[PDB]
Design an enzyme around this catalytic site. Structure first.
Site, PDB file in Angstrom:
ATOM      1  N   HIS A   1       4.712   5.664   2.462  1.00 31.94           N
ATOM      2  CA  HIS A   1       4.786   6.927   3.221  1.00 31.94           C
ATOM      3  C   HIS A   1       5.690   6.804   4.432  1.00 31.94           C
ATOM      4  O   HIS A   1       6.286   7.789   4.833  1.00 31.94           O
ATOM      5  CB  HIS A   1       3.420   7.400   3.696  1.00 31.94           C
ATOM      6  CG  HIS A   1       2.470   7.815   2.627  1.00 31.94           C
ATOM      7  ND1 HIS A   1       2.861   8.276   1.398  1.00 31.94           N
ATOM      8  CD2 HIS A   1       1.125   7.917   2.668  1.00 31.94           C
ATOM      9  CE1 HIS A   1       1.802   8.637   0.708  1.00 31.94           C
ATOM     10  NE2 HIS A   1       0.735   8.439   1.464  1.00 31.94           N
TER      11      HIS A   1
ATOM     12  N   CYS B   1       0.829  -1.203   0.000  1.00 32.79           N
ATOM     13  CA  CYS B   1       0.000   0.000   0.000  1.00 32.79           C
ATOM     14  C   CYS B   1       0.856   1.243   0.000  1.00 32.79           C
ATOM     15  O   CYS B   1       1.933   1.272   0.580  1.00 32.79           O
ATOM     16  CB  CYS B   1      -0.994  -0.026   1.201  1.00 32.79           C
ATOM     17  SG  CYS B   1      -1.997   1.446   1.476  1.00 32.79           S
TER      18      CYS B   1
ATOM     19  N   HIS C   1       0.644  -3.550   6.569  1.00 31.70           N
ATOM     20  CA  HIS C   1      -0.655  -3.504   7.224  1.00 31.70           C
ATOM     21  C   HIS C   1      -1.829  -4.100   6.473  1.00 31.70           C
ATOM     22  O   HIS C   1      -2.932  -4.214   7.068  1.00 31.70           O
ATOM     23  CB  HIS C   1      -1.002  -2.063   7.625  1.00 31.70           C
ATOM     24  CG  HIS C   1      -1.151  -1.126   6.474  1.00 31.70           C
ATOM     25  ND1 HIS C   1      -0.106  -0.684   5.702  1.00 31.70           N
ATOM     26  CD2 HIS C   1      -2.284  -0.695   5.873  1.00 31.70           C
ATOM     27  CE1 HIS C   1      -0.583   0.093   4.745  1.00 31.70           C
ATOM     28  NE2 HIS C   1      -1.918   0.059   4.799  1.00 31.70           N
TER      29      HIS C   1
ATOM     30  N   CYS D   1      -6.831  -3.533   3.649  1.00 29.83           N
ATOM     31  CA  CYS D   1      -6.678  -2.091   3.534  1.00 29.83           C
ATOM     32  C   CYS D   1      -7.314  -1.521   2.307  1.00 29.83           C
ATOM     33  O   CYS D   1      -8.386  -0.946   2.382  1.00 29.83           O
ATOM     34  CB  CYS D   1      -5.203  -1.583   3.653  1.00 29.83           C
ATOM     35  SG  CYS D   1      -5.267   0.204   3.541  1.00 29.83           S
TER      36      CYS D   1
ATOM     37  N   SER E   1       0.518   3.750   1.772  1.00 27.19           N
ATOM     38  CA  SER E   1       0.798   4.163   3.150  1.00 27.19           C
ATOM     39  C   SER E   1       2.067   3.525   3.721  1.00 27.19           C
ATOM     40  O   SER E   1       2.767   4.149   4.505  1.00 27.19           O
ATOM     41  CB  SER E   1      -0.350   3.884   4.078  1.00 27.19           C
ATOM     42  OG  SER E   1      -1.534   4.533   3.668  1.00 27.19           O
TER      43      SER E   1
HETATM   44  N1  LIG Z   1      -7.782   6.634   4.678  1.00 27.55           N
HETATM   45  C1  LIG Z   1      -7.305   5.386   4.661  1.00 27.55           C
HETATM   46  O1  LIG Z   1      -7.693   4.578   5.515  1.00 27.55           O
HETATM   47  C2  LIG Z   1      -6.260   5.021   3.650  1.00 27.55           C
HETATM   48  C3  LIG Z   1      -6.113   3.653   3.344  1.00 27.55           C
HETATM   49  C4  LIG Z   1      -5.334   3.270   2.257  1.00 27.55           C
HETATM   50  C5  LIG Z   1      -4.640   4.272   1.600  1.00 27.55           C
HETATM   51  N2  LIG Z   1      -4.623   5.617   2.036  1.00 27.55           N
HETATM   52  C6  LIG Z   1      -3.992   6.666   1.264  1.00 27.55           C
HETATM   53  O2  LIG Z   1      -4.636   6.807   0.026  1.00 27.55           O
HETATM   54  C7  LIG Z   1      -3.714   7.267  -0.930  1.00 27.55           C
HETATM   55  C8  LIG Z   1      -3.745   6.386  -2.155  1.00 27.55           C
HETATM   56  O3  LIG Z   1      -3.198   5.093  -1.868  1.00 27.55           O
HETATM   57  P1  LIG Z   1      -2.926   4.102  -3.046  1.00 27.55           P
HETATM   58  O4  LIG Z   1      -4.118   3.978  -3.939  1.00 27.55           O
HETATM   59  O5  LIG Z   1      -2.333   2.854  -2.430  1.00 27.55           O
HETATM   60  O6  LIG Z   1      -1.793   4.939  -3.809  1.00 27.55           O
HETATM   61  P2  LIG Z   1      -1.247   4.891  -5.300  1.00 27.55           P
HETATM   62  O7  LIG Z   1      -1.343   3.523  -5.853  1.00 27.55           O
HETATM   63  O8  LIG Z   1       0.106   5.522  -5.244  1.00 27.55           O
HETATM   64  O9  LIG Z   1      -2.198   5.823  -6.137  1.00 27.55           O
HETATM   65  C9  LIG Z   1      -2.161   7.241  -6.098  1.00 27.55           C
HETATM   66  C10 LIG Z   1      -2.561   7.770  -7.469  1.00 27.55           C
HETATM   67  O10 LIG Z   1      -2.525   9.220  -7.389  1.00 27.55           O
HETATM   68  C11 LIG Z   1      -2.058   9.729  -8.644  1.00 27.55           C
HETATM   69  N3  LIG Z   1      -1.601  11.113  -8.503  1.00 27.55           N
HETATM   70  C12 LIG Z   1      -0.448  11.513  -7.967  1.00 27.55           C
HETATM   71  N4  LIG Z   1      -0.458  12.874  -7.989  1.00 27.55           N
HETATM   72  C13 LIG Z   1      -1.638  13.290  -8.558  1.00 27.55           C
HETATM   73  C14 LIG Z   1      -2.228  14.564  -8.911  1.00 27.55           C
HETATM   74  N5  LIG Z   1      -1.620  15.689  -8.641  1.00 27.55           N
HETATM   75  N6  LIG Z   1      -3.420  14.541  -9.450  1.00 27.55           N
HETATM   76  C15 LIG Z   1      -4.087  13.433  -9.730  1.00 27.55           C
HETATM   77  N7  LIG Z   1      -3.551  12.190  -9.469  1.00 27.55           N
HETATM   78  C16 LIG Z   1      -2.328  12.155  -8.890  1.00 27.55           C
HETATM   79  C17 LIG Z   1      -0.953   8.744  -9.051  1.00 27.55           C
HETATM   80  O11 LIG Z   1      -0.617   8.821 -10.430  1.00 27.55           O
HETATM   81  C18 LIG Z   1      -1.573   7.398  -8.581  1.00 27.55           C
HETATM   82  O12 LIG Z   1      -2.196   6.722  -9.670  1.00 27.55           O
HETATM   83  C19 LIG Z   1      -2.350   7.343  -0.208  1.00 27.55           C
HETATM   84  O13 LIG Z   1      -2.126   8.657   0.304  1.00 27.55           O
HETATM   85  C20 LIG Z   1      -2.545   6.408   0.942  1.00 27.55           C
HETATM   86  O14 LIG Z   1      -1.643   6.647   1.995  1.00 27.55           O
HETATM   87  C21 LIG Z   1      -5.510   5.965   3.014  1.00 27.55           C
HETATM   88  O1  LIG Z   2      -3.321   2.798   4.329  1.00 32.06           O
HETATM   89  C1  LIG Z   2      -3.881   3.018   5.646  1.00 32.06           C
HETATM   90  C2  LIG Z   2      -3.219   4.032   6.529  1.00 32.06           C
HETATM   91  C3  LIG Z   2      -3.803   5.270   6.869  1.00 32.06           C
HETATM   92  F1  LIG Z   2      -4.978   5.583   6.334  1.00 32.06           F
HETATM   93  C4  LIG Z   2      -3.182   6.168   7.654  1.00 32.06           C
HETATM   94  F2  LIG Z   2      -3.781   7.322   7.949  1.00 32.06           F
HETATM   95  C5  LIG Z   2      -1.971   5.856   8.203  1.00 32.06           C
HETATM   96  F3  LIG Z   2      -1.385   6.730   9.016  1.00 32.06           F
HETATM   97  C6  LIG Z   2      -1.365   4.665   7.902  1.00 32.06           C
HETATM   98  F4  LIG Z   2      -0.197   4.365   8.460  1.00 32.06           F
HETATM   99  C7  LIG Z   2      -1.981   3.753   7.081  1.00 32.06           C
HETATM  100  F5  LIG Z   2      -1.374   2.581   6.836  1.00 32.06           F
HETATM  101 ZN   LIG Z   3      -3.170   1.080   3.478  1.00 30.62          ZN
END
Ligand SMILES: NC(=O)c1ccc[n+]([C@@H]2O[C@H](COP(=O)([O-])OP(=O)([O-])OC[C@H]3O[C@@H](n4cnc5c(N)[nH+]cnc54)[C@H](O)[C@@H]3O)[C@@H](O)[C@H]2O)c1
Ligand SMILES: OCc1c(F)c(F)c(F)c(F)c1F
Ligand SMILES: [Zn+2]
Ligand SMILES: NC(=O)c1ccc[n+]([C@@H]2O[C@H](COP(=O)([O-])OP(=O)([O-])OC[C@H]3O[C@@H](n4cnc5c(N)[nH+]cnc54)[C@H](O)[C@@H]3O)[C@@H](O)[C@H]2O)c1
Ligand SMILES: OCc1c(F)c(F)c(F)c(F)c1F
Ligand SMILES: [Zn+2]
Ligand SMILES: [Zn+2]
Ligand SMILES: [Zn+2]
Lengths: 374, 374
Positions: B51, B46, B67, B174, B48
């Site tokens: 990150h 993921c 995770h 996730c 995250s």
């Molecule tokens: N809230 C939650 O519980 C949770 C859970 C899982 C993931 N996350 C977050 O969600 C986000 C996405 O995760 P993911 O899908 O695994 O990531 P990912 O696979 O990297 O996808 C992100 C997408 O964003 C695109 N992107 C980057 N910059 C831009 C821009 N300026 N405009 C438009 N598109 C852009 C990029 O090309 C990619 O396809 C990350 O920040 C994670 O940390 C949050």
């Molecule tokens: O992808 C899920 C996820 C989150 F949404 C967070 F906000 C975070 F801090 C983290 F560590 C994480 F794994």
């Molecule tokens: Zn995640």
């Protein structure tokens, strides 16, 4: 005898920001098609009217302000079907055209015909009905209630009960409905919940009324003017706090008091800082915060979006989220049936000619609502 | 037998930010009371987890990250009642203690026992079960799935169907559940609505899946990487837009495309700018915008609260708003009943030993989800 004729009458004209209103003669044109000319009976002094004076709210000047009012129809333009001469009416600062995508939506109220987002200070047709000293004067929010006579578009007026006391129900045109609706409709306050209300003016008091009507178990009023606390408790606040009394920021204090954050918070002041404080004080996973206050023009707030990621909901609304033309007459009917009270909001009564004194009372902190009588 | 004994096994240790994972031997202590030791079968990569590597997310180092996973219970501590040795399980990065005010709330899911808000990188008891080269190694979100064996608190694990394919259902830990729940539960996408999804990675594709399952009529994908568009359309996007193709800001483009704003928008990237853009592109009176992406640590966004005062709703959520231990087994049951698909998210399947190569695929834009198999 006045139908189809220009009416000369007194109005409170604001020529310049940061200056007293000028009570002087204006010329009020007769209504065009789908317009309604109203003889004003009562109008409240709302803080948003003061915002026009202070430049917090930017709208074209010179202007006839006023948006919280009630009156009697003097005449109707061609094609008007929803009111008649002699009807009691409340002008609607948020219109309800009934046709746009917002009006058709089950929840929305901020009709696309509004003159709030990008104010022109005109009628719907882009012109003005007001002249003073030979000069055109702008309208405000399509209402312009600080005048013995005004002209409004049909979509900005609601017919109300013929037996209505206008000197009370004018508050349904803004402050009561906004606060009450913000609690009941926008926030959807639940039974047993804990609420925090920032700002204990007329609108915040009305939010408290709504939270109490919805069954909240705890309603914490927040104001820097402790003189506002007694009335807040009378209308349902269970406790009141003054941020100036505490060494810690009030979001921390409220979080502590609510054993981890409140269910619902409301910003009813108009400050960027209290908008973020009010968000922060609601419980991080399930809390809801509603922005009611009007902030200073063109200014951005700064916040950490982690406040939202954890689960908070943040929203705002105009006019308590209520569809205006539908809702105003119902609220008047409910007032007549004693479903809610307006008297707690009315602290002062003045003739219209003492409008400046009325604004002095609001600015000093002394009043909640002053009602002006024409 | 391994029960009651220290296990020596392979794990991916992150010793410092912005360096590759070190694949090496760690010691995994046996579970204490109310703890569960799990033999991992599959774990997803993921964003995250990336990150943590990039410093976008701050958590104590050194650490065993990961995770999004599934595995099989090796042993249980005293007092565990909800799983048994041999059970298939998914670790829960958002716990469900069942006792806190959030767990008891009908809507909330961000259990107060989480290690996200103020990460300690430990078990619930404030200690670690991991050692590497004689040094204690931190946990991550109570899960630490980048190891052949992990130890989790009982509140951080769910039993799932014994017949489940763990190399697919690990995504329920996730990315799938987050995106799908963000659409269906948090936003409450409605039939016939128009949605905009910013970010077309694994999570954003799952948001599309949920918007389509909820009956949206239009689903507009937004990404700067046009290579992501084909798969977005396969899973339900009706159109895709690249902001880089336009001379105007994309909120303006999206407002125009949707004839005045979208019903629901989702930020699924992790940028402050796109969070404000996503909010802006929802309809001003009744739009809802959900923040899913994780932004950089300790950075504030700037926004004009008039975007909310007109009537928008802004919210965020962790793990799709889902109560984790209740929801995960039901999602797996639903997957087994063919209610949704996971295969469209999986672009690569690598042995665990190629974790670094898996992260490189993500960072280059080439993968959606890589599944690592133990
Ligand atoms: N809230 C939650 O519980 C949770 C859970 C899982 C993931 N996350 C977050 O969600 C986000 C996405 O995760 P993911 O899908 O695994 O990531 P990912 O696979 O990297 O996808 C992100 C997408 O964003 C695109 N992107 C980057 N910059 C831009 C821009 N300026 N405009 C438009 N598109 C852009 C990029 O090309 C990619 O396809 C990350 O920040 C994670 O940390 C949050
Ligand atoms: O992808 C899920 C996820 C989150 F949404 C967070 F906000 C975070 F801090 C983290 F560590 C994480 F794994
Ligand atoms: Zn995640
Ligand atoms: N959203 C809408 O439709 C709508 C309708 C009506 C009013 N408004 C706005 O709502 C706000 C309240 O209006 P009102 O009730 O007529 O105003 P008001 O009577 O001036 O009440 C505001 C209260 O805020 C208090 N206050 C000021 N600063 C602080 C502080 N830092 N902390 C805590 N309390 C403070 C102040 O003492 C006063 O009692 C104004 O900004 C209006 O413009 C919005
Ligand atoms: O008090 C109601 C009210 C508002 F809520 C505004 F947002 C506004 F711009 C305004 F002029 C006004 F009168
Ligand atoms: Zn309308
Ligand atoms: Zn007002
Ligand atoms: Zn809990």
């Amino acid at each position: 005898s006045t139908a189809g004729k220009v009416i000369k009458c007194k109005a409170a004209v604001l020529w310049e920001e940061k200056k007293p209103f000028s009570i002087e003669e204006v010329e009020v044109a007769p209504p065009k098609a789908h317009e309604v000319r109203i003889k004003m009976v009562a109008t409240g002094i709302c803080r948003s009217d003061d915002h026009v004076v202070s430049g917090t709210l930017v709208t074209p000047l010179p202007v006839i302000a006023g948006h919280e009012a009630a009156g009697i129809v003097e005449s109707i333009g061609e094609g008007v079907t929803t009111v008649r001469p002699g009807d009691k009416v409340i002008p609607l600062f948020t219109p309800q055209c009934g046709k746009c995508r917002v009006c058709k939506h089950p929840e929305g109220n901020f009709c696309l015909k509004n003159d709030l987002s990008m104010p022109r200070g005109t009628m719907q047709d882009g012109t003005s009905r007001f002249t003073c000293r030979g000069k055109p004067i702008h309208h405000f929010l399509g209402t312009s209630t600080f005048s013995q006579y005004t002209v409004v578009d049909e979509i900005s007026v609601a017919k109300i009960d013929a037996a209505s006391p206008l000197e009370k129900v004018c508050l349904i045109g803004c402050g009561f409905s906004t606060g009450y609706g913000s609690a009941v409709k926008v926030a959807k306050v639940t039974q047993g919940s804990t609420c925090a209300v920032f700002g204990l003016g007329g609108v915040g008091l009305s939010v408290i009324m709504g939270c109490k009507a919805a069954g909240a178990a705890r309603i914490i009023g927040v104001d820097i003017n402790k003189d506002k606390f007694a009335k807040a408790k009378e209308v349902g606040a269970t406790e009141c706090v003054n941020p100036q009394d505490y060494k810690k920021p009030i979001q921390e204090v409220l979080t502590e008091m609510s054993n981890g954050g409140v269910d619902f918070s409301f910003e009813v002041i108009g400050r960027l800082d209290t908008m973020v404080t009010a968000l922060s004080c609601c419980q991080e996973a399930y809390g809801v915060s509603v922005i009611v206050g009007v902030p200073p023009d063109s200014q951005n707030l700064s916040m950490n979006p982690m406040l939202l990621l954890s689960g908070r909901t943040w929203k705002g609304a105009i006019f308590g989220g209520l569809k205006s033309k539908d809702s105003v007459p119902k609220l008047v009917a409910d007032f007549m049936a004693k479903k809610f009270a307006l008297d707690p909001l009315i602290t002062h009564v003045l003739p219209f000619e003492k409008i400046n004194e009325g604004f002095d009372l609001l600015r000093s902190g002394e009043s909640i609502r002053t009602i002006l009588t024409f």
